[PDB]
C-alpha cells in the first residue's frame, strides 16, 4: 500500500482591507507541513522567522534589497491593485436571501412551538436575523445554527425561536442584508 | 473587513500543485496546471477580469524547489495526518421532488489529498457531481466542497464517502429526507 511520508509547502499572500482601501495590510506567509516558519508583515516592514526553521529564509530574503523593496510596495501594486480589479464582482456582489418560516419538525417540550426562520442563497455573508413577538424583539429562546458558507459564493443559516404560542400572536422574523434597502419580514400567525 | 488571499502549495511525493485566489473565504479562481489556464469559480468572473495562468506555473516551480530545501532542512520531518470533519447538507431547505443540491463539506484536514464518493442507496453516483479545489484556512489546514444535484424523495438516501490517510477507515456521512 501507499504509506510514504508526505511533505507539504504552502505560500500565502494575504491582503487585508479596512474601510475599503484606506488601511491595507499585506501578510506573506510560508508554512512547511502545518508549521508557519517565516513571514513578511507589511506593518513590520521586513521578513521575520516564525520558528527556527524559517530563520535562514528571513535572513537571506532580508539581505535582498530588490525583494524587500518589492514587498514593501505590494500593499499598493498588489493589494490595492487587485482590490480595484475585483471590487465590482466581489465587494459589490449582492444576492438577496430567500426567507421562509415554518415550525421545526422537532418540537420537543409539548405545549410549545419551536419556530424556524430559514435564510438561504444570499451573499455577502454579513446579515442580521432577528425574531419579534408583537413588534417587540425576542432576546431569549433564540438559537442559531450559525453562518454557513456553501463554497459557491452563497450562504445559509437557520435561526430558531422556542415559543409558547397564544392564538392571535404574530411572530416576525426580520432579516437585514446588504442586498435590500429595507428589512425583510416573514410572519408566523399563532 | 475584506481579505483577498493568493494561496499556493506543492505536496510531495504526490506531486500535487495548486494556485488559487480567495475572497472572504470564497474561491475566485485557480489555475489548471495541466491545461495551463485560469478556471474562474463563477463563469461571469472571467468576463470582468483575467489572470495570466503562466504566472502560477512559474511560482509553482519555485514552491517545489523550496519544498525540497525545507524537507531536507527539517531532517525529512513528514507531515502529521489530520483527518477531516465531514458534514452533509443541502444548499437550501429540502422539499419533495423539489430540485436541490447535496453538499459534502470536508474541513479541517491535511495533507490536501482526499477521495470522495457519493452513494445513492449504497451505489456510487457520478452524474451531475462537481467539486472545488482545496481551500485555505487560518490554521493552515484545508477545506473542500463536493456537490450532488438531486431530486428529493423518501425513497432515496445518500452517503458522502470520504477517504483520507488520517481516517483509519473510510467515513460515510449519511443523508435522507428526515420527516
Amino acid at each position: 500500500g501507499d504509506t510514504r511520508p508526505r511533505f507539504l509547502w504552502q505560500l500565502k499572500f494575504e491582503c487585508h482591507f479596512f474601510n475599503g482601501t484606506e488601511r491595507v495590510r499585506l501578510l506573506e506567509r510560508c508554512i512547511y507541513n502545518q508549521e508557519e516558519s517565516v513571514r513578511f508583515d507589511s506593518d513590520v516592514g521586513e521578513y521575520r522567522a516564525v520558528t527556527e526553521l524559517g530563520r535562514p529564509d528571513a535572513e537571506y530574503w532580508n539581505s535582498q534589497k530588490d525583494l524587500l523593496e518589492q514587498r514593501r510596495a505590494a500593499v499598493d501594486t498588489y493589494c490595492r491593485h487587485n482590490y480595484g480589479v475585483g471590487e465590482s464582482f466581489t465587494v459589490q456582489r449582492r444576492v438577496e436571501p430567500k426567507v421562509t418560516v415554518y415550525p421545526s419538525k422537532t418540537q420537543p417540550l409539548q405545549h410549545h412551538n419551536l419556530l424556524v426562520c430559514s435564510v438561504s442563497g444570499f451573499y455577502p455573508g454579513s446579515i442580521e436575523v432577528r425574531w419579534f413577538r408583537n413588534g417587540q424583539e425576542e432576546k431569549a429562546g433564540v438559537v442559531s445554527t450559525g453562518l454557513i458558507q456553501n463554497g459557491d459564493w452563497t450562504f445559509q443559516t437557520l435561526v430558531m425561536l422556542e415559543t409558547v404560542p397564544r392564538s392571535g400572536e404574530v411572530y416576525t422574523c426580520q432579516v437585514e442584508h446588504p442586498s435590500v434597502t429595507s428589512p425583510l419580514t416573514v410572519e408566523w400567525r399563532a | 473587513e475584506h481579505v483577498i488571499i493568493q494561496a499556493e502549495f506543492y505536496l510531495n511525493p504526490d506531486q500535487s500543485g495548486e494556485f488559487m485566489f480567495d475572497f472572504d473565504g470564497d474561491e475566485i479562481f485557480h489555475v489548471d496546471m495541466a491545461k495551463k489556464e485560469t478556471v474562474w469559480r463563477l463563469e461571469e468572473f472571467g468576463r470582468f477580469a483575467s489572470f495570466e495562468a503562466q504566472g502560477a506555473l512559474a511560482n509553482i516551480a519555485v514552491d517545489k524547489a523550496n519544498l525540497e530545501i525545507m524537507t531536507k532542512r527539517s531532517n525529512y520531518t513528514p507531515i502529521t495526518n489530520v483527518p477531516p470533519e465531514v458534514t452533509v447538507l443541502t444548499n437550501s431547505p429540502v422539499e419533495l421532488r423539489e430540485p436541490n443540491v447535496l453538499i459534502c463539506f470536508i474541513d479541517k484536514f491535511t495533507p490536501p489529498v482526499v477521495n470522495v464518493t457519493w452513494l445513492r442507496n449504497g451505489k456510487p453516483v457520478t452524474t451531475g457531481v462537481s467539486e472545488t479545489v482545496f481551500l485555505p484556512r487560518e490554521d493552515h489546514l484545508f477545506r473542500k466542497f463536493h456537490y450532488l444535484p438531486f431530486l428529493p424523495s423518501t425513497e432515496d438516501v445518500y452517503d458522502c464517502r470520504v477517504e483520507h490517510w488520517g481516517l483509519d477507515e473510510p467515513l460515510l456521512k449519511h443523508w435522507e429526507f428526515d420527516a
Binding site: 530574503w61 535582498q64 498588489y78 | 475566485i28 477580469a49 504566472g55 519555485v62 524547489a65
Partner: peptide, 13 residues
C-alpha cells in the same frame, strides 16, 4: 482588468 500575482521568493540552496 488583470489580477496580478506576487512572485515566490526562492530559499537559498
Amino acid at each position: 482588468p488583470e489580477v496580478i500575482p506576487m512572485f515566490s521568493a526562492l530559499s537559498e540552496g
